[PDB]
Structure formats: C-alpha cells, structure tokens
C-alpha cells in the first residue's frame, strides 16, 4: 500500500508503520530502513530527492513520483513461509529549486519604428520543481525612459507561460539604440525563489533616412583643355542610417552625352575628374545633376545640381574674312578695281574674329608691306574694316597688288593669322 | 539698329525699312532679302527658326535671340564711298514646340507603408520654346482608387518646376502592387501644347510579414532504431512577402543535445530525418521547437512545437533477478538451505522485468529440468515470484541443486533470458 513522504527530509524521519498485520527490507535499499517486530519504516543518510530519482525523470506534469520498495514478513512463531508486501512511497515535492534562465544575459533585437503593440518572445525560465513550486510569474524592471517603451505580457496559450516584450512607443535607432531591462522570474513556493536576467533590447536599423548632400548645389571652375584625370570637384552626401543603409553611391542623374563624355564620376568617392577634351568653344558650361543613393534594399536617394564653368584658353587663332561691298565684288580671292578711282575708295570689306574670349579674342589687325591700302574701322572681338586706297591709282605700275592682312590676339602665347586679296586694275585713257 | 520679328513667318514678310537715311545685303544671307532704292527688308524661303539658329543655342533664360546682318549704302549720286549699317534682328518666340517627357512610360518605385506626405520626384518634361511658351503645368490623371493614394505637387524652389508624387494613403504590396496614373504636361502658350506619359507606380516590398507554420504544433510517430536518413516529419511555414523577405530557413529553436544528436533538420526543406540511434529506452518522446525565419535584412520568425513519439521495438531481453528473502540469503549466486524443511518453503525471491513495452515486455517465466522447486506469483512486465520447494528434502542425494530459471517475451522475434541458483543443503539426523 501507499505512503506520502516529503523529499529531502532529515535522516530517520518516520514515514510510517503497518496499518496491516521479523519485518525485513528486501527492496528500496539506499533510501529506506525498517525495524523488525514493529513494521515501522524511516528515511536514511541518503535523502530521497524528487528531482534526483531515476524513476521520476521524464514525467508529464501531474504524474506522482513513486519510489517502490518491498519488505518481507518472515515470522509467525516460525510457522509460515514468508508473505511479502510490495509498497509504494509517493514523494511529495518541496520548493528546493530556483527558476533559472538559460543565460543571465538575454539579447533582443527589435527593429526601429516597430508598430506599437508588437510582441517579442523572451526565453522561458525553467524550474526543476513541480506544479505550484515551479515558474509562477515574470516581472519586467526598467528605468523610467524604458518603462514607457516596453511592457511585459505572458501567453498562457501553450499551457506553459511564454513571456513577451510589448513595444509601446516608437523606437528610433538614430536617437537611441540600446536599452537595459531586467527580467525577473519567480516561482509559486512559500517562500518564493527568484532569479533575474539582464534583458538587452538592441534597436535594429531600418533604412528610414535618405542621403543629404553637404551643399544643395555645387559650382566649380575648370580650365578648357585640362589633362585627363584633372580633379574637377568632389560631391559628398551623408546618411544617418547604419551599414549599407548609409553606404552611398554617386552616379549622374540628368546628364547629357556631351557631359558624360568629358566627366567621370567615381561611384564611391563622388570625385569628378576629366575624361575627355574640354572645349570652352563647344561648351562653356557643364550643367548636370548628381544622384546620391544608399545601398538599402529599397535605396533612398538625393540629387544635387552641379555647374562647371569652363574657362578660356587662347587655343584659337583669329580669322580674317575678306569679302566685297556694293559693286566691288571678289572672285576666287581676287578683285577688279579700275585705275583712276578716288583716293580712299574702299576695295574690300574685312571682318576679323576670334573664337576665344576676353583678351584671348581681342584682335589687332593691320596691313603688311608697302602697298597704297589701309584699314578703317567701319562698325570688340569682332571688328569690321573698310580696306581703302591711300593714293590715286594709274596703270603706270599696277595690276600687281597682293594685299596681305595680318591679325593677332592678346593671348599668351599670342596667335596670328594672315589672309590676302589680289587687286587687278584696268587702265583708263 | 534693332528689329523685332517673330520666327517661322511665311516668306516675304516685311520686317521693316529705314527710319535711317543702292541698299545691298552683305551679311545675313540665307534668311533676309533687301530691295535697293527703298532700304526695305524681308524674310525668305529659309525661315528664321528661333530653336534652329546656331547663335541661339545654350542661352540663359531671358537673353534675346539676335540674328546679325549687314547692309551697305552704296549710292549718293555716285559720290561717296559706301557707309555700312550693322543691324540686329531680335527673333520673337512663337509656341511651335510641344513639352515632352524623355520617355512616354515613367516608372516609380514606392515602398510599402511609406508615410503619408512622402514626396517622390517625377522626371521633368522639357520644351524647346522660351519663357511663357515653355512648361506651365503638370496634371495627374488617375482612376478613383488611385486618386485617393497619390497627389501631385510642384516645387518652384529650383526656379525650374520639379513635379512630385505625394503618397496620401497606405500602400500594401500584399493587397495591390501596381498603379497606372497618367502625368500630363502643358505649356503656357495660347493655344497650349500638351503631352502625356504613363506613370506607373510599383509598390516595393518591405519585410512586414512573419512566417506562419501550416500547423501551430506538429506530432509524429517514429520507430525506435529507425535507419539513418529515415524521414520523421516535414515542417513548413509560409510568408506573404517577396523574394528574400519570404525565403525561409528552418533551425532548431529549443532543442536539447539528446534530440540534436538523433534528428537532422534541413534549413531549406524543413524535413526532419534520423541522424543517430533512436532508443525508446533512453528517450520515449522527442520534444523540441522549430524556428522558421525569413531571409529579410531584419529577419522575422515563428516557432512551432514538435512532439515525436518513439515507438517500441523488442530489442531487450528480459532480466531475471534472483535474491534472498528473510533469513535465507544468497552468497555469490549460491544459497544454504538445510535438508528437512517444510514442503513449499521458499528458497529465493525471483524478480523478472523487461526494459521494453506492452507485448515486448510481457514475460513468461519458468523452471528448467526435473528439480523439486517451482515459482509462485508473490505480488505486468515486472513479476515477483517465490522460488519454493515441491517436495521434502533429505541429504539422501542432494547439495547438488542447480536451479535454472528461463524467461521469455511476447515480442517478435521473442527474446529469452536465463539465470540460475545453486542450493547447498545441510544433513539433519
Ligand atoms: Ca530536491
Ligand atoms: Ca522552485
Ligand atoms: Ca523539489
Ligand atoms: Ca530612425
Ligand atoms: Ca548602443
Ligand atoms: Ca539611408
Ligand atoms: Ca535608421
Ligand atoms: Ca577650344
Ligand atoms: Ca584667340
Ligand atoms: Ca578658347
Ligand atoms: Ca593709264
Ligand atoms: Ca521654331
Ligand atoms: Ca511650347
Ligand atoms: Ca519657338
Ligand atoms: Ca504589407
Ligand atoms: Ca502588379
Ligand atoms: Ca517576411
Ligand atoms: Ca511585404
Ligand atoms: Ca532499445
Ligand atoms: Ca523485450
Ligand atoms: Ca524497445
Ligand atoms: Ca539425512
């Protein structure tokens, strides 16, 4: 028959004697002792430990822990052969075990901007005791700031208490990214046993920030004809997110072929260098946008206008255009003017121009040898001149006039150009 | 002096005559014609196109487009040498160009759950005309559903109109992930010219969904001693997100060494196979959780309890334990019982047990040769027997009793065990 006895009781505690009937202990050997003539049965210097017994290991909750034993009634005035009695001692549980977390530091990663109400599981504490003497409650201990951000809930759904962090306010990683709470587990023994763990919440990053350029808009001056590799400007943007969410790539946004041909933009450095032949005479300003884009899964981006002013070099010689006026008309660079026409009548029209700018296009223009023609301003960097006679002409020694015009810049080095006009005359009586 | 003339006017339009004073056209050659004796000046079969002229290419807004020309006054009763007049014709702009998007399909990616108010840039339309005859307005045309989700704003900040989509309601990719709007660009000419583009918004995924198991909880039966590779159960979770945000990895959540040793869980298939020697006698149930975790940047997850019931095989032979009772006591497997002791006095206590379950542990037990001992039930799968004498004993032909006990299962195949006891007697007068 049965016997209810608390575990871990001190040696020689009476567990009972026979409500039935030499009494000898055949089975139960380390844990029990019997006395003969009485049938009374006590604990020993090996204590019955409800969590220690082999028999009571993987038991489902509510199944008693039963230690089995046999004693043999072996006297009846030395008459009978023995009768044995197969007893059962049901070991009662005392609260001799503390509830424990697997690790004393517990580490939760909660994303930024997680919706209020969101639940996150906390590792279960466990307790080797049974029923009421096992896990009873979880308690969240937090600083004022954190008290308002994190709650604690327990789900009794699994029929085993699963504790959960509730997020209750907005988390922002860029404001604050680590919270220290304590989680305390207590059992339902009297007195209770209790255990604590450090519960860190780390706020995981989300890509909730776009790059921003250091300046809204960028300018730079760049010399025409700069060598390949010449540094033009460096753009830079910043991003307040973490890792790849703040890693940035620079690419041309709106940028026509003409610009892409001349300028190279490094994805990583945002440094713009020369890559082709810059020519103020083809393009005097490079206008384009740069795109700064993060390496988030759904990248965010920003755009910046850049204006590169192209600066003049004196790389163009002046042009001398020699054409007719009124009735006097050139053919294949020669002109028919008849002997005996008024002094300072105009034989040709001379236009002078320079494709460069400022000084580099400021042109002086003048006539070569000893020939009886000069230039008169007719109308800077485009000058129009009458090419007119200095003297009267007779067919004396003439039809041999090659007039040679020379023009020069104010560049450095200065550039020169020359063009000529043949005038054939006609004799008059 | 100047002259204001609209572009693309029909040949022979009068652009004026001399408020000043043979008149001859020296410069301006394809586009203008003059008549002599009058000084009156008209357009030709080559039309002045304000967007076509070389002179008027990369002009900043508000700088007139000036076509330059020269005519020479070359008669004064055939007295003077010629005077030239360097004229300027300022070409007025008409609205002869339509505003255009670079592509007629424009493609915006807006993330799911983007905060209401968020702005997203729409590519600029451009228009080769000038001032009021260029881009005036942008218009967003959308279906009822979309009208409420997307607004349109223009920023006049850059001093060039930058249009922007405003998100005005929640987008959910899992509800709907493609919207067709039309964007219409109109200029400020009378009549206006206008152009449209298809503006697709595609709603980009965010990892806003956690995996869910097909079942909350899983059971399976598994035979003890199953071969390596035997399929146990397959767990499966689903995730309503896109690509990696719904790609799932299965790993043990809470799972003790003992289980991890026996069971293998494929990260990709969620199939659990046998990997070690399952032994109902060591562990009769495998209890563990499985974690399903997505491959999002900040993974979300779900847990499922699994219970594997381990099923018995008859892989254990019965045990025969032979021990003393009362005063009769065994030493080194032999026992001292004296000749002349009552018929059916008990020489030993025989306990029989089988580590298996049900039939596989149901034990029949019996005595071997012709020896004057039998077994009596003393007290299934643990049976206790008195080993008692059948006859009286005299030292006639004795001290030579080797009693052999045999026990068998009800398994398949059945298993057998044997143990023996020597009894030495003592002669009495
Ligand atoms: Ca204990
Ligand atoms: Ca406890
Ligand atoms: Ca206990
Ligand atoms: Ca943030
Ligand atoms: Ca921190
Ligand atoms: Ca970012
Ligand atoms: Ca962030
Ligand atoms: Ca040049
Ligand atoms: Ca020059
Ligand atoms: Ca130059
Ligand atoms: Ca002559
Ligand atoms: Ca036009
Ligand atoms: Ca227009
Ligand atoms: Ca126009
Ligand atoms: Ca969604
Ligand atoms: Ca779609
Ligand atoms: Ca997901
Ligand atoms: Ca989603
Ligand atoms: Ca086994
Ligand atoms: Ca068996
Ligand atoms: Ca078995
Ligand atoms: Ca005898």
Author numbering:
A (entry chain A), B (entry chain A): 3 to 23, 32 to 389, 394 to 443
Provide the publication's sentences verbatim.
Protocadherin-1 (PCDH1) is a non-clustered δ1 protocadherin involved in respiratory diseases. PCDH1 has seven EC repeats (labeled EC1 to EC7 from N to C-terminus), a single pass transmembrane domain and a cytoplasmic domain with the three conserved motifs (CM1–CM3) typical of the δ1 subgroup. PCDH1 may bind bronchial epithelial cells and epithelial cells of the airway mucosa together by mediating homophilic adhesion and helping in forming the epithelial barrier. Here we use bead aggregation assays to show that repeats EC1 to EC4 form the minimal adhesive unit for human (Homo sapiens [hs]) PCDH1, despite its longer extracellular domain with seven EC repeats.
The first two, PCDH1 EC3-4bc at 3.05 Å and PCDH1 EC1-4bc at 2.85 Å, were obtained using bacterially produced protein. There are three calcium ions in each complete linker region (EC1–EC2, EC2–EC3, and EC3–EC4) and one calcium ion at the end of EC4. Calcium ions at complete linker regions are coordinated by highly conserved canonical calcium-binding motifs XEXBASE, DXD, DRE/DYE, XDXTOP and DXNDN. An additional calcium ion near the EC2–EC3 linker is unique, it is at a crystal contact, and it might be present due to purification and crystallization conditions with high calcium. Analyses of the interaction interfaces with the Protein, Interfaces, Surfaces and Assemblies (PISA)48 server revealed large interface areas of 1539 Å2 for PCDH1-I1 (385 Å2 per repeat; 486 Å2 for EC1:EC4 and EC4:EC1, 231 Å2 for EC2:EC3 and EC3:EC2) and 1270 Å2 for PCDH1-I2 (423 Å2 per repeat; 461 Å2 for EC2:EC4 and EC4:EC2, 190 Å2 for EC3:EC3) respectively. Both interface areas are greater than 856 Å2, an empirical cut-off to distinguish biological interfaces from crystal contacts. Altogether, these data indicate that the PCDH1-I1 interface mediates trans homodimerization in solution (independently of possible cis dimer conformations induced by C-terminal EC repeats or the Fc tag) and that it is responsible for bead aggregation in vitro.
